[PDB]
């Protein structure tokens, strides 16, 4: 299990203050959202199990990512100075930090990765004692965060407060935070060729694997695989298709690999 | 549970 905090800080050249869309993703489920353009200017709950948290917690979180919003404003200014970019550009600071836990709730591995304008600006390694870098601006951020040992404080957060809140959400979300349908639909394409689409629905998390195996041989040719598309209510969707000649429907099957499946189902329509 | 720490770039 893991808790991801994705931060987006797209600046606006004179259209107002930088947008600070910030979200919380414990496992593959969003539970808290912060929108700098939202009317409430508050921590809108995004999960049925986080609406039970106390108003003190909500005030703490909303003050915290208001502070993070102004932090991203200042960081945008500093980076625009670093990259020597003009203020007329809509620059983005996208920040993700998070912490991994085992089934026992014990901390496994912490994440803190930063990206400016798409490129991976700076990230926290697996040790959680030092940072990575990509360019000279990332070198300046490296020097600043190693002079004040920002890595130590970030690691403290990740293996302290991060995992504490994560496991608290676990007791909050036993029924939700912790099974693809696999319809195996077919649609004719041509008298000599056809495509088979096995329709996996409502599986959580998104670590699905579809391979389109034929009882021993691996196929990646003509097996186009779409990205892990969520359905909207926290689950995800996945499917794949194979270009095959018509009339051999029984010869091709897809194998499903999901955490929620007791056994990997295989359909042979 | 959100990071109270804000390290600056």
């Amino acid at each position: 299990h893991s808790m991801r905090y994705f931060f987006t800080s797209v600046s606006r050249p004179g259209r107002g203050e930088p947008r600070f869309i910030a979200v919380g993703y414990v496992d593959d489920t969003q539970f808290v959202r912060f929108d700098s353009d939202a009317a409430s200017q508050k921590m809108e709950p995004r999960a049925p199990w986080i609406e039970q948290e106390g108003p003190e917690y909500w005030d703490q979180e909303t003050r915290n990512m208001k502070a993070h919003s102004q932090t991203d404003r200042a960081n945008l200014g500093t980076l625009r100075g670093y990259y020597n970019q003009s203020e007329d550009g809509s620059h983005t600071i996208q920040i993700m930090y998070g912490c991994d836990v085992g089934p026992d709730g014990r901390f496994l591995r912490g994440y803190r990765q930063d990206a400016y304008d798409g490129k991976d600006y700076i990230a926290l390694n697996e040790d959680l004692r030092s940072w990575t870098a990509a360019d000279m601006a990332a070198q300046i951020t490296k020097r600043k965060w190693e002079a004040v040992h920002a890595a130590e404080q970030r690691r403290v957060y990740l293996e302290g407060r991060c995992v504490d809140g994560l496991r608290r959400y676990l007791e909050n979300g036993k029924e939700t935070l912790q099974p693809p349908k696999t319809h195996m639909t077919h649609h004719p394409i041509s008298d000599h060729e056809a495509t088979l689409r096995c329709w996996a629905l409502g599986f959580y998390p998104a670590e699905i694997t579809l391979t389109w195996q034929r009882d021993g041989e691996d196929q990646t040719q003509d097996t186009e695989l779409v990205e892990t598309r969520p359905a909207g209510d926290g689950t995800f969707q996945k499917w794949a298709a194979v270009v095959v000649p018509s009339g051999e429907e029984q010869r091709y099957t897809c194998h499903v690999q999901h955490e929620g499946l007791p056994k990997p189902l295989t359909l042979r329509w | 549970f959100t990071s109270d720490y804000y390290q600056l770039y």
Epitope: D59, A67, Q70 | D4, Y6
Partner: T-cell receptor, first 113, second 110 residues
Framework: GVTQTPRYLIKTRGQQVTLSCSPI?????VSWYQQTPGQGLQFLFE???????NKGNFPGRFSGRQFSNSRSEMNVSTLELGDSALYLC?????????????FGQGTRLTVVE | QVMQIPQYQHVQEGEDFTTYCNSS?????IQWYKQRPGGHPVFLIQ?????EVKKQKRLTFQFGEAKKNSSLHITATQTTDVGTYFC????????????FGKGTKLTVNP
């Protein structure tokens, strides 16, 4: 390097009493502290960019504000005898955890009868 | 909530002003304030969770190489060392910014 005024204001009970703090140049977070000898450093309220981010356990009569230049002022209305404390300003370069909260010289308020 | 165990510690100008700052809820930083009597708490240094010890002047700071621990040591105390040494803890998750230990009134004998 925090300049804080007034130094030894002596306004009596009631009154308004405004205490001004000028944080270190570049510090955008200001924290307010009351040094009652019977309770030590008590957190009043913290200001970061014109907003009360963190507030301590004090009545509504303890109010403050922060200006555009990150300078902060506090107001202590309807004073009683228990407010004769050295009020302190803690200037953090940034709000939240992980910032060296430097301290101003203090405002030794006394609520004379 | 931090517990600075030596509420007051009257020593002589010889040595030994260990002011161990017991705490739970592992501290991101501790910081240390030397409140000169009749004065403001002067910031000494912030002990980020790098563990180890820091040797500012003749004082010896010590942040525990583990969760939720800290300390401080003047070694050779002197007259100018008199003051209420204060803990702090930003302690990610706390509504109050810095939770202070109740201080350690250090007095020395020439």
């Amino acid at each position: 390097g925090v300049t804080q005024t007034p130094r030894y204001l002596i306004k009596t009970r009631g009154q308004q009493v405004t205490l001004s703090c000028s944080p270190i140049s570049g510090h955008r977070s200001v924290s307010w502290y009351q040094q009652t000898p019977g309770q030590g450093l008590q957190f009043l309220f913290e200001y970061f960019s014109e907003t009360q981010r963190n507030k301590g356990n004090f009545p509504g009569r303890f109010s403050g504000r922060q200006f555009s230049n990150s300078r902060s002022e506090m107001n202590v209305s309807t004073l009683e005898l228990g407010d004769s404390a050295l009020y302190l300003c803690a200037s953090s370069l940034w709000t939240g955890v992980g910032t060296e909260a430097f301290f101003g010289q203090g405002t030794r308020l006394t609520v004379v009868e | 909530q931090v517990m600075q165990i030596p509420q007051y510690q009257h020593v002589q100008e010889g040595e030994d002003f260990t002011t161990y700052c017991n705490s739970s809820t592992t501290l991101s930083n501790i910081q240390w304030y030397k409140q000169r009597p009749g004065g403001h708490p002067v910031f000494l240094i912030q002990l980020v969770k790098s563990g180890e010890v820091k040797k500012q002047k003749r004082l010896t700071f010590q942040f525990g190489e583990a969760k939720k621990n800290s300390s401080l040591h003047i070694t050779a105390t002197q007259t100018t060392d008199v003051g209420t040494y204060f803990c702090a803890s930003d302690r990610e998750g706390g509504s109050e910014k810095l939770v202070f230990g109740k201080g350690t009134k250090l007095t020395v004998n020439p």
